[PDB]
């Protein structure tokens, strides 16, 4: 009955309010916390509620209803350092030990100004090929599904930050044994825009 | 603050090891836990003080120690393939709240053989003449594959220099055959840029896999080479074209 956080994941675009829903069952509640764990390195201290309700501390607030055994973490102006997990975490028996919920995954998703999604071949490096495709600069909307094909490997959605021009872009990689596989039928699977630019020459 | 050690660690099947874990913010309250995926943490054994070891609830099949109040050790004594996962150790005050002070994690792989641990083939694509007009902008796409197991740090360098601009990295690195139990892994990471600088020759770009494997006590008599801690490097040049 324990520790029930939201599970695995929550999505959220950056400029965004999250609430991370958090419910327990304890014997003895010695107070609640948040803790942030980015993947995948150790977990930092964000809240401790022993009393009802509501504290700010900052660009986060958490909620306390002893009433209910009801938490939820608030992360407003949402940006893309949160993506990480949050974990929910009971302090039980008299101080001695902090229980952990499961943990919510909350991936941040980039908000695009000026989206031209296209699907570009990379050539590799050394020799051969080996052909990869690149699936960039498409809006937050786009989800990218995995492949009907077992033979093909596809990389979910990442944001490249680039700090120097204020931009930040989303991407999705494919590649696939000398079969041959192609760029034109490499993300089939997914529900992808109109407009996708398809370069090959 | 709290200090833990190894990082990385991969044991054979029946084998023992322990978990080093030194506070040196004289704290009372340490604990140990594990963390697997659909996880969460989940504490094996932790000690209220110098010599007193506690409760669950995950505490089959660890030992745990407490001799003195800076160190608290995490003992495997027959390592089973279930034992895999990410361990955090944890130092605490109370009355000093009460907020925890996690360890940075050990990941720890327990194999039945040893032989199918292997390292990365590492692989940078150059970026595509097309991106650069459409966009004027240059993503090069790195790949490691065909390691085991997931124990691999990968880092971007440009001109001998760490780059963090522009870089993204996946997380997780994805199973090659996912049913297959001793599965061979890969993992992708883009650097972006401007067109400009990916066409200036001079620039020197490479993605830097660092591998955990086998450790110096590893006895290794095969004709392979030994599959030990290593980097595994693939680099582009900058393309005038």
């Known amino acids: 009955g324990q520790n029930i956080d939201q599970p695995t994941e929550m999505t959220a675009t950056e400029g965004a309010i999250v609430q991370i829903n958090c419910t327990y069952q304890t014997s003895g509640f010695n107070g609640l916390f948040w803790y942030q764990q980015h993947a995948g390195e150790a977990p930092t201290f964000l809240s401790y509620?022993?009393?009802?309700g509501l504290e700010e501390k900052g660009r986060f607030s958490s909620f306390l209803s002893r009433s209910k055994g009801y938490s939820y973490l608030l992360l407003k102006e949402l940006q893309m350092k949160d993506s990480a997990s949050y974990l929910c975490a009971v302090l039980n028996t008299g101080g001695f030990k902090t229980i952990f919920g499961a943990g919510t995954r909350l991936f941040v998703k980039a908000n695009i100004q000026n989206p031209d999604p296209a699907v570009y071949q990379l050539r590799d490096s050394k020799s051969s090929d080996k052909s990869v495709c690149l699936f960039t600069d498409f809006d937050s909307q786009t989800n990218v599904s995995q492949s009907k094909d077992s033979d093909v490997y596809i990389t979910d959605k990442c944001v490249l930050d680039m700090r120097s021009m204020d931009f930040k872009s989303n991407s999705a990689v494919a590649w696939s044994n000398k079969s041959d596989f192609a760029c034109a039928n490499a993300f089939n699977n997914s529900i992808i825009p109109e407009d996708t630019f398809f370069p090959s020459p | 603050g709290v200090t833990q050690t190894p990082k990385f660690r991969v044991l054979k099947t029946g084998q023992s090891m322990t978990l080093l874990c030194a506070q040196d913010?004289?704290?009372?309250?340490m604990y140990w836990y594990r963390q697997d995926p659909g996880m969460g943490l989940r504490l094996i054994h932790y000690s209220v003080g110098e010599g007193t070891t506690a409760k669950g609830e995950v505490p089959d099949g660890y030992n745990v120690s407490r001799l003195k109040k800076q160190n608290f050790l995490l003992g495997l004594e027959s390592a089973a393939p279930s034992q895999t996962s990410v361990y955090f150790c944890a130092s605490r005050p109370p009355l000093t709240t009460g907020e925890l002070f996690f360890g940075e994690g050990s990941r720890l792989t327990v194999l039945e053989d040893l032989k199918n641990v292997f390292p990365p083939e590492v692989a940078v694509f150059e970026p595509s003449e097309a991106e650069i007009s459409h966009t004027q902008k240059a993503t090069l796409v790195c790949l490691a594959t065909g390691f085991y197991p997931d124990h691999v740090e990968l880092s971007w360098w440009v001109n001998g220099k760490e780059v963090h601009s522009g870089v993204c990295t996946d997380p997780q690195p994805l199973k090659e055959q996912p049913a297959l139990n001793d599965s061979r892994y890969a993992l992708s990471s883009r650097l972006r840029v401007s067109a400009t600088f990916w066409q200036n020759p001079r620039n020197h770009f490479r993605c830097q896999v660092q591998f955990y494997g086998l450790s110096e006590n590893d006895e290794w008599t095969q004709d392979r080479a030994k599959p030990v801690t290593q980097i595994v490097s693939a680099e582009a040049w900058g393309r005038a074209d």
């Open positions: 913010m004289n704290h009372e309250y």
């Open positions: 509620n022993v009393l009802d």
